[PDB]
């Protein structure tokens, strides 16, 4: 079961449903047909967020090392705001 | 103070195992719940390090004091040493949500005089300048 | 009433360096006979109990990140059944051993840490005993048949 | 060993993962359940080079440290509309701002 993300600039993101609920308001987005609108959040934004759902979901409570989620300077700002809106 | 280091005066091999990307700051909490910073660790190194039985030790990034695990979990306890093999102390990165790992690339690109001049909520002002630090976490994990 | 102990640490750490050859640098009236007195009742403390003075010089393994705990540790440990003059002597002895091991193993900062610490572990732990004891004048007297 | 992709088609991107010893065909599958076109009507890329259906993914470069989960590797998609194969065409992605005065060194 996926699920599609549309970004502010028309981008069209399809994850697994089970990573996007990482975010609280994701999941209340789609509770209330398997697609949302993020007005707010540009491609470049959005789809470095749904990288986080692979990673988050990929290695939490896992035993193996675990690498530095990266973060470019120049989308650190807009990415902050996004995880804030998101929370996640 | 419940967080502490017991005075066992049991000696504990342990090798501190540094599988992060970050430089560890070990910390042991002494006989009075005080923590005491001890040598840093590179990334990806290991130091076999003498200890007690029934202490209490917890690891953070040397520069910024973010938390980190030790054994998947927040502290570490030194135990009894069988057959002669220290124990591992394997330190590893958490997986940190989205919003904290974005304050600490923030933080670590803007000084903290300047945190207010982003064009940001004013909620992520004060998430910004709420620094990791050993003490809140310690008091957090005593009412656990 | 009583007397500055922070002068009577100062005054024994720098005897206690002296007689090893180190000079120590950065740093209500004492009477003259309290500080002479201690240095040989420290000196005699030593001297009949070579072999935990010797046991300590060895098992200190000093360094700035442990030397807080290693002091707690050993004082709390002396005076665990209570305070007496004896163990008050063996008090500046252990204070002194740690300031002539720090030089030894040029770590000659924790010399004004542990002068510090045994000036706050006497103001805060031991005062109340020593003036309800007498105070110095008692113990430069009870070490008089001595010198 | 598994490898995390992200398989683009114009503003389409499609985060899944597979194992190495997944061949290209079985990467066609799954977009099948995904976006409902067979196989036959798919061609897949890394960079330009068109990915034949037997080989492992290994093979064609996509390793675990070359497609991480926090940074995976990117896989084009072309749809065949009747007859003809569509070119392959990926719209890049929105650029950020220029980068705030307080965050410059």
């Known amino acids: 079961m996926y699920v599609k993300l549309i970004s502010s600039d028309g981008h069209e993101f399809i994850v697994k449903r089970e990573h996007a609920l990482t975010s609280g308001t994701i999941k209340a987005m789609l509770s209330g047909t398997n697609e949302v609108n993020f007005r707010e959040i540009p491609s470049h934004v959005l789809s470095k967020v749904c990288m986080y759902f692979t990673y988050k979901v990929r290695y939490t409570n896992s035993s193996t090392e675990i690498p530095e989620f990266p973060i470019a300077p120049e989308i650190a700002l807009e990415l902050l705001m996004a995880a804030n809106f998101l929370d996640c | ?144 | 009433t009583g007397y500055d102990n922070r002068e009577i640490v100062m005054k024994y750490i720098h005897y206690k360096l002296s007689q090893r050859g180190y000079e120590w640098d950065a740093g209500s009236p004492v009477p003259p006979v309290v500080h002479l007195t201690l240095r040989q009742a420290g000196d005699d403390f030593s001297r009949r109990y070579r072999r935990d003075f010797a046991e300590m010089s060895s098992q200190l393994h000093l360094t700035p990140f442990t030397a807080r705990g290693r002091f707690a540790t050993v004082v709390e440990e002396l005076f665990r059944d209570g305070v007496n003059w004896g163990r008050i002597v063996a008090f500046f002895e252990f204070g002194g051993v740690m300031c002539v091991e720090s030089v030894n193993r040029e770590m000659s900062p924790l010399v004004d840490n542990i002068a510090l610490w045994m000036t706050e572990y006497l103001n805060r732990h031991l005062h109340t005993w020593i003036q309800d004891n007498g105070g110095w004048d008692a113990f430069v007297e009870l070490y008089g048949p001595s010198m | 060993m598994d490898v995390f992709l992200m398989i683009r088609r114009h503003k389409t991107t499609i985060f899944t993962d597979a194992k190495e010893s997944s061949t290209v065909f079985e990467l066609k599958r799954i977009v099948e359940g995904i976006l409902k076109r067979p196989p036959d009507e798919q061609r897949l890329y890394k960079d330009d080079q068109l990915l034949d259906d037997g080989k492992t993914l290994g093979e064609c470069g996509f390793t675990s440290q070359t497609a991480r989960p926090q940074a995976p590797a990117t896989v084009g998609l072309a749809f065949r509309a009747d007859d003809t194969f569509e070119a392959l065409c990926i719209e890049p992605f929105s650029s950020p701002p220029e980068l705030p005065d307080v965050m410059k060194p």
């Open chain 2, 1 to 144: 103070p419940v967080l502490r280091s017991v005075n066992s005066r049991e000696p504990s091999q342990v090798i501190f195992c540094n599988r992060s990307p970050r430089v560890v700051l070990p910390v042991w909490l002494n006989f009075d719940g005080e923590p005491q910073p001890y040598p840093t660790l590179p990334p990806g190194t290991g130091r076999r390090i003498h200890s007690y039985r029934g202490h209490l030790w917890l690891f953070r990034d040397a520069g910024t004091h973010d938390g980190l695990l030790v054994n998947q979990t927040e502290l570490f306890v030194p135990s009894l040493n069988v057959d002669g093999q220290p124990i591992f102390a394997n330190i590893t990165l958490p997986v940190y949500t989205l919003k904290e790992r974005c304050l600490q690339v923030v933080r670590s690109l803007v000084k903290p005089e300047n945190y207010r001049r982003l064009d940001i909520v004013r909620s992520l002002y004060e998430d910004l300048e709420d620094h990791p630090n050993v003490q809140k976490d310690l008091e957090r994990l005593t009412q656990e």
